[PDB]
Amino acid sequence: PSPYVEFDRRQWRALRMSTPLALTEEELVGLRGLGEQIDLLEVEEVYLPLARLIHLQVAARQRLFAATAEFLGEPQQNPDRPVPFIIGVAGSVAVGKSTTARVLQALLARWDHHPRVDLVTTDGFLYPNAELQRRNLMHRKGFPESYNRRALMRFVTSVKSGSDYACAPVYSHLHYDIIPGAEQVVRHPDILILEGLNVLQTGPTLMVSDLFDFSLYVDARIEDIEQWYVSRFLAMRTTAFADPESHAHHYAAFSDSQAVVAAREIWRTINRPNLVENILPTRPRATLVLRKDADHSINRLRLRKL
Amino acid sequence: PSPYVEFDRRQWRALRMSTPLALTEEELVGLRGLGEQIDLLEVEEVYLPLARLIHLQVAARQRLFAATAEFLGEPQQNPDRPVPFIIGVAGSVAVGKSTTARVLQALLARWDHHPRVDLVTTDGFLYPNAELQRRNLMHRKGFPESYNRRALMRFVTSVKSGSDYACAPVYSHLHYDIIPGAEQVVRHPDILILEGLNVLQTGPTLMVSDLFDFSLYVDARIEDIEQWYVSRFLAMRDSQAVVAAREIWRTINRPNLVENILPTRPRATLVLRKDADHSINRLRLRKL
């Protein structure tokens, strides 16, 4: 055996799983508001049942908190609430982590056992571009050393310790840099989804993933992800890169052919080695691995056996 | 705040717990004849309720397996049984890991929910002495690189995969080495306790602790453990013996603790700190 239960997409459809808390047409169409990539068949057939499987784990942890509190006679030392349930979402630049995380957020928010579902990306913990510069790490942006790991650990520890106030910095995805002074405040959510390139990375002592209750790694063939990466880079020329304030503004005027060259070379020298060296080795650590085919649909699900 | 709920022994004792936690003959099956190893007061005040606390987690996991299998419609690829619940037990040489593990093994096996509880020490995954010699590692016996980590991972993976047969080699403390040809077979127990110097240590990808459901670190002041190690060494075999015990502690076991074992303490679900007389004076449990 392996430590995973495995389904391909045909097997998954053949489970004929039931939606209890089922969405209407208008609620599903509402989800097209989450991002350009949203496919309602992926949502309904894959993500809805995944959300229910995760919900079972969250509810189980809430009930175990209550059973343990009552066993102990609810001492003053013991918190009154279960701490937040934290879900990591890992995977390559451009594999679809953020869309997946946003779908899970919107679906998990639908249960009254846990209506407060916050989503924090670890991009917020990247050093600013000027600070990467001063640290000699611009060429390694997205590698584990390009993050303030101390800050990231402090933030997740605060949340997992049950604090009522924890603050994270914020990255501008349009300017490709940290927003000075900006913060996202998290206040003992029911679930925290933590998304980013370093979330399952291991470390010599406590690592951030020691605070997770569940993690998902979004997977695909390296060459398919390269394609999605080049496509996204070309698409940014007239959107994100168009703003003269963007750190990537210099890219806005590249021709299609020049943009493919620039994107493939960023992939070749930064994102691909980061994936091979740092991200792909963490794939077996995740509770759930979802593989996407070339067309972005999930073709394989591997769930750790309970 | 703290990621732990913390009790000293007084506060732990003051807890008004929800079950009787009776110490009766029946409750001590599998624990007849507690050595100089542990006092029945410790068993009653500390281990009975720890066993019930862990039982809650095991039963919650079993029920989650059943809810998930019912949601999935019990397909062919889903196992028919929850996989074994794995508990790691970490801490210095001579801190009391093996006693703690054996006590929990017997107490946990009393529940009808999970009557089959195995105990495997990772000492059985040390390279044999002849191999440690080829690697120049005798003086680092018990350090991370003195174990066959690939074999240890294959074994724990096979157990957590729901296998009906996983074999571990066996170490002899009497003969100071792996026993050639001996094996310990583990056959899908409800609970596997995995005790050893290295069980919470980290590595670059999937690590053994990734497959744990719960873990304990047995802690004490380093000067107290040194006295326990010297006393055990003497009892195992005079001022000659004290010289030899102290050489091994200073050269091998103490540096291993400082460099490799103590840094893993914060990774454990539950830390139990022992005072100089071996009684637990502090328990630190991860908030649920």
Curated annotation (Swiss-Prot), chain A:
GO terms for biological process: coenzyme A biosynthetic process. The keyword Nucleotide-binding applies. Its EC number is 2.7.1.33. InterPro entries: P-loop_NTPase (IPR027417), PanK (IPR004566), PRK/URK (IPR006083). ATP binds at G91, S92, V93, A94, V95, G96, K97, S98. The keyword ATP-binding applies. Disulfide bonds: none annotated. It is an enzyme of class 2 (transferase). It is found in: Cytoplasm. It catalyses: (R)-pantothenate + ATP = (R)-4'-phosphopantothenate + ADP + H(+). It comes from the Bacteria. Was identified as a high-confidence drug target. This is Pantothenate kinase. The lineage of its organism: Bacteria, Bacillati, Actinomycetota, Actinomycetes, Mycobacteriales. The gene is coaA.
